[PDB]
Amino acid sequence: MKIEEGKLVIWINGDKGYNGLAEVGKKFEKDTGIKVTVEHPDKLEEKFPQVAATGDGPDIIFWAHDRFGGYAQSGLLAEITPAAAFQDKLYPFTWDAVRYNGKLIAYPIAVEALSLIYNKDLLPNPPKTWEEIPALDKELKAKGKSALMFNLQEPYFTWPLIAADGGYAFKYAAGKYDIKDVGVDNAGAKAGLTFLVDLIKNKHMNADTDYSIAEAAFNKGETAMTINGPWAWSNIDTSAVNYGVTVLPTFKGQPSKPFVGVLSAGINAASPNKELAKEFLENYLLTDEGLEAVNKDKPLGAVALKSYEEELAKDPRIAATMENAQKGEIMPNIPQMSAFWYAVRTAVINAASGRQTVDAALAAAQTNAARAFAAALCRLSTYLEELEAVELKKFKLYLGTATIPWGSMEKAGPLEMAQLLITHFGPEEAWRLALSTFERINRKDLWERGQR
Amino acid sequence: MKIEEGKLVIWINGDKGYNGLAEVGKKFEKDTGIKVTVEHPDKLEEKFPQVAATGDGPDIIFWAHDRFGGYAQSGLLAEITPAAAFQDKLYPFTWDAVRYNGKLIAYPIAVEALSLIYNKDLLPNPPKTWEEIPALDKELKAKGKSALMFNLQEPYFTWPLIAADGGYAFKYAAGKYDIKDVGVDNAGAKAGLTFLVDLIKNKHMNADTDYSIAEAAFNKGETAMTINGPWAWSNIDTSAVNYGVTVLPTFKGQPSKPFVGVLSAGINAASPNKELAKEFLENYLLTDEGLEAVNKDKPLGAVALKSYEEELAKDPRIAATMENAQKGEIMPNIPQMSAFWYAVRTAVINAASGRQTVDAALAAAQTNAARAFAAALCRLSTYLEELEAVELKKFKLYLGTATIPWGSMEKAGPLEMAQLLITHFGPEEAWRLALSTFERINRKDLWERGQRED
Numbered sequence: 030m031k032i033e034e035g036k037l038v039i040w041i042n043g044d045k046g047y048n049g050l051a052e053v054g055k056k057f058e059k060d061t062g063i064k065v066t067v068e069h070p071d072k073l074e075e076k077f078p079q080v081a082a083t084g085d086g087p088d089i090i091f092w093a094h095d096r097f098g099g100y101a102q103s104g105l106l107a108e109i110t111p112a113a114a115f116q117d118k119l120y121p122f123t124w125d126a127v128r129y130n131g132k133l134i135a136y137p138i139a140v141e142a143l144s145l146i147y148n149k150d151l152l153p154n155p156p157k158t159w160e161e162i163p164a165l166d167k168e169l170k171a172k173g174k175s176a177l178m179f180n181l182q183e184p185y186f187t188w189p190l191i192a193a194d195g196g197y198a199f200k201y202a203a204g205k206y207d208i209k210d211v212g213v214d215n216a217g218a219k220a221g222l223t224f225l226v227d228l229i230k231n232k233h234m235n236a237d238t239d240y241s242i243a244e245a246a247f248n249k250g251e252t253a254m255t256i257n258g259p260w261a262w263s264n265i266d267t268s269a270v271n272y273g274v275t276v277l278p279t280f281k282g283q284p285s286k287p288f289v290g291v292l293s294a295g296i297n298a299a300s301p302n303k304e305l306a307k308e309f310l311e312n313y314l315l316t317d318e319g320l321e322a323v324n325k326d327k328p329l330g331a332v333a334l335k336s337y338e339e340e341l342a343k344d345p346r347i348a349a350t351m352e353n354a355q356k357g358e359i360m361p362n363i364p365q366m367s368a369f370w371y372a373v374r375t376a377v378i379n380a381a382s383g384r385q386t387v388d389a390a391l392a393a394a395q396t397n398a399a400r401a402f403a404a405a406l407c408r409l410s411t412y413l414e415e416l417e418a419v420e421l422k423k424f425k426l427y428l429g430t431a432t433i434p435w436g437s438m439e440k441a442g443p444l445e446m447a448q449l450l451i452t453h454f455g456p457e458e459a460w461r462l463a464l465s466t467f468e469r470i471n472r473k474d475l476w477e478r479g480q481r
Numbered sequence: 482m483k484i485e486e487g488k489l490v491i492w493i494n495g496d497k498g499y500n501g502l503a504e505v506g507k508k509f510e511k512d513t514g515i516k517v518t519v520e521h522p523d524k525l526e527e528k529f530p531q532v533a534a535t536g537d538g539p540d541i542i543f544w545a546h547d548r549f550g551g552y553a554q555s556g557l558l559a560e561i562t563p564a565a566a567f568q569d570k571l572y573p574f575t576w577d578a579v580r581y582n583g584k585l586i587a588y589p590i591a592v593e594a595l596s597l598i599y600n601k602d603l604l605p606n607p608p609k610t611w612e613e614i615p616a617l618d619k620e621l622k623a624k625g626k627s628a629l630m631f632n633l634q635e636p637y638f639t640w641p642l643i644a645a646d647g648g649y650a651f652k653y654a655a656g657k658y659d660i661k662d663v664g665v666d667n668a669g670a671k672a673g674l675t676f677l678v679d680l681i682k683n684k685h686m687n688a689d690t691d692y693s694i695a696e697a698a699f700n701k702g703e704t705a706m707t708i709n710g711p712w713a714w715s716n717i718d719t720s721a722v723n724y725g726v727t728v729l730p731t732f733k734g735q736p737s738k739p740f741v742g743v744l745s746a747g748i749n750a751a752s753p754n755k756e757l758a759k760e761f762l763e764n765y766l767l768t769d770e771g772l773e774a775v776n777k778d779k780p781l782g783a784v785a786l787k788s789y790e791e792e793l794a795k796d797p798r799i800a801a802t803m804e805n806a807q808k809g810e811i812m813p814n815i816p817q818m819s820a821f822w823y824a825v826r827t828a829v830i831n832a833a834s835g836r837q838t839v840d841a842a843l844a845a846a847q848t849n850a851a852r853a854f855a856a857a858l859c860r861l862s863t864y865l866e867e868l869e870a871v872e873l874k875k876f877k878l879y880l881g882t883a884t885i886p887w888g889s890m891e892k893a894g895p896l897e898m899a900q901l902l903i904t905h906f907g908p909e910e911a912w913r914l915a916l917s918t919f920e921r922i923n924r925k926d927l928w929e930r931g932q933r934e935d
């Protein structure tokens with residue numbers, strides 16, 4: 030369905046409750062006369078920035094919040110302006126997840142974290158540690174079963190283990206993420222991925238295992254454990270499996286640290302239906318009845334709507350989800366997240382398959398994930414090199430009142446100035462400040478060029 | 482102007498034994514008629530690269546080896562080619578310090594490491610730790626003395642403490658330094674500099690203390706300790722102080738880690754007197770008699786000449802020098818060293834004065850020391866960006882076949898390619914190789930424009 034004024038087209042991932050969302054859409058149409066079409070395209074999170082400005086994109090896009098900063102930086106998302114009463118209906122930390130450079134860029138829907146899911150009839154007492162899993166697998170293999178199967182093709186699922194002993198994405202410090210400081214090839218990351226690779230070398234897991242292979246094995250009663258999120262509980266409910274949901278195993282005595290996602294709904298900046306989309310999202314979806322319809326299809330996790338979460342929170346599966354969430358980290362929403370995930374996806378797949386050592390794979394991922402800093406630095410310095418000597422002086426002065434000590438800047442050339450801007454404010458803010466200051470020193474040419 | 486033919490002009494720092502060196506020069510003149518002039522200009526390590534780039538300067542320059550890789554890269558130093566029997570006379574690790582890009586670029590003279598020097602009458606037992614020094618100062622202050630004074634204006638002297646708990650210049654791995662990995666603002670570096678600044682805040686040291694102030698205070702018996710190298714011992718000999726030379730204090734249980742220098746003699750690439758210089762250095766200076774003449778003026782430290790060092794090593798001051806040298810690290814000689822030193826110099830001065838916090842000062846130093854990599858990267862990426870798709874492919878093909886894995890290069894964009902090249906070759910060679918290849922793939926315009934870059 031193409032976008033047209035007077036209707037809504039919604040994209041949501043295929044593992045979520047899209048049939049439930051379509052029920053909310055049908056209720057909306059009943060009550061307003063306005064048609065809603067829910068779709069679940071493959072790779073929608075890659076497709077959206079390719080087609081967002083066209084009629085072949087959606088009016089509303091659902092994804093975890095980590096992708097949204099990149100979308101907003103590219104001008105793809107409308108600013109969200111909820112009134113006071115509506116904002117108070119949702120938990121503050123969920124609004125935080127969708128805040129980007131001081132603006133709300135989506136509606137938060139639900140908090141997602143991975144848990145350990147286990148078959149109580151194969152495994153009444155699940156392991157508290159990763160280290161126990163080889164022994165468990167050995168005994169289960171004797172019965173033609175296995176201990177653990179989960180998706181090894183997406184780094185989301187392996188990240189909790191990589192992070193446990195000290196791996197991280199971007200270091201948080203000074204009120205921001207430092208995109209130069211990447212933690213994917215430190216000792217902790219290496220330790221975690223080496224444990225994963227050792228499980229595969231010792232035939233306790235298969236490098237080819239993906240989402241569908243793991244889901245089928247668990248729901249058929251072939252493997253004792255899997256790792257997945259709340260959306261997966263619906264198919265297990267349907268299965269004959271008596272299952273539990275519990276804290277992830279520790280590694281080297283430390284909790285597994287899943288990256289926590291907030292399912293979020295953004296409004297296409299190019300949509301002729303922005304007000305229509307706001308009405309649907311605020312007054313039909315983010316209601317008790319709306320979220321229940323989606324949740325009944327596939328569980329959302331811990332929803333952002335206080336009134337409905339007070340019910341869901343009593344569910345032990347939700348308590349476990351929140352326990353794992355608290356041990357993990359909220360994902361950044363910065364634009365560099367896409368490149369981080371691609372880099373780590375390649376590292377895990379290459380290490381797991383044996384095509385690269387863990388050391389080589391993570392070293393390459395480190396370099397790939399950090400290239401965004403180098404690119405930002407070189408671009409900013411190249412613009413600053415255009416300034417005349419007197420214009421650079423004025424540039425440094427105005428950086429005080431825009432909001433770095435003058436003594437730190439006085440001697441600095443264009444490259445050092447780019448370094449200072451990015452290290453102090455981060456890449457996006459450094460760029461915004463630079464271009465803004467350009468039009469303050471009569472270099473609107475640079476401002477114009479920088480816009481393009 | 483060209484350097485004058487038929488004599489030798491030598492530059493050496495004023496804190497070294499230049500009068501003793503002039504005595505060796507006179508011995509040379511007695512045998513050969515060749516006049517040797519020894520000078521000690523201020524800031525000679527900064528003046529030499531300016532003067533030598535234009536083909537002027539001294540015939541021979543003495544400095545620690547860390548400055549020499551930069552000089553060599555700029556074409557300022559002649560390759561040294563001593564015969565095997567001569568090379569055999571000096572310790573292998575001193576030759577290592579003066580090797581750059583596979584070639585020897587200077588003669589090593591002596592190993593220099595900082596030690597703790599103490600007044601045995603004020604302080605019969607020197608402190609094991611840095612941590613105990615504030616209490617020591619409090620006690621001495623009640624006797625009209627102080628515990629410790631040393632030069633706070635040059636980072637050489639403060640580096641041993643900054644490095645003790647984990648600070649480092651450039652990361653060393655696989656016989657190669659990584660210039661994008663700078664260790665001047667990690668936890669260890671911050672802890673060390675914070676201790677120094679707290680010494681000053683609590684009035685156990687003065688941020689304004691420099692070399693001459695510290696030397697006077699120690700040599701007049703006003704402070705119980707100083708930190709200095711072997712060149713300082715002669716002046717202390719002439720004072721009334723009964724002194725010892727010992728291991729530096731530890732910090733958080735870790736030894737202080739001085740950056741170790743090898744005093745080295747380089748031959749100016751522009752000199753018409755290279756044979757004279759070789760003859761002087763090999764057959765007059767680097768002999769027992771030659772080094773003794775210099776050493777008796779101002780001590781050299783642990784000399785590179787095996788035969789003379791076997792005598793000096795019996796001196797407990799030399800044993801202590803070598804103990805501190807072992808706990809420290811030989812300085813890199815890569816061109817980026819001078820930028821590192823300038824960066825840390827500013828950081829220590831600003832933190833000590835209270836102009837910046839330790840965290841702000843070391844953050845700036847980190848940025849400044851890291852800029853050499855970034856500058857090379859941004860320039861090389863800009864030039865590779867100018868290549869058409871088919872030219873970039875050709876650029877890669879020549880680099881992959883020439884008499885770096887293809888898998889690393891094949892799908893790399895200009896910025897990634899610039900990264901690969903600088904990492905694999907170093908910034909200087911990466912750039913020269915790039916320009917050379919531009920010429921090879923019908924982009925002589927980039928070669929031409931590139932040659933005119935700074």
Ligand SMILES: OC[C@H]1O[C@H](O[C@H]2[C@H](O)[C@@H](O)[C@@H](O)O[C@@H]2CO)[C@H](O)[C@@H](O)[C@@H]1O
Pocket residue numbers: 042044074093094095096141183184185186290370
């Ligand atoms: O694997 C990288 C991937 O991780 C996250 O995607 C999750 C998503 O958040 C979940 O709701 C569910 O759909 O599983 C996905 C993993 O397959 C990030 O949100 C995503 O951007 C990233 O590519």
Ligand SMILES: OC[C@H]1O[C@H](O[C@H]2[C@H](O)[C@@H](O)[C@@H](O)O[C@@H]2CO)[C@H](O)[C@@H](O)[C@@H]1O
Pocket residue numbers: 494496526545546547548593635636637638742822
């Ligand atoms: O302070 C930085 C400075 O340290 C070293 O200089 C030493 C030199 O090696 C010693 O022989 C003696 O003269 O003291 C100097 C410090 O004042 C490095 O060799 C030099 O490059 C660097 O700038």
Ligand code: NA
Pocket residue numbers: 265266267268269270
């Ligand atoms: Na069931």
Ligand code: NA
Pocket residue numbers: 366367368370371
């Ligand atoms: Na990605």
Ligand code: NA
Pocket residue numbers: 717718719720721722
């Ligand atoms: Na004396």
Ligand code: NA
Pocket residue numbers: 718719720
């Ligand atoms: Na004496």
Ligand code: NA
Pocket residue numbers: 715776777778779780
């Ligand atoms: Na003397």
Ligand code: NA
Pocket residue numbers: 806807808809810811
């Ligand atoms: Na050592």
Ligand code: NA
Pocket residue numbers: 818819820821822823
């Ligand atoms: Na310097």
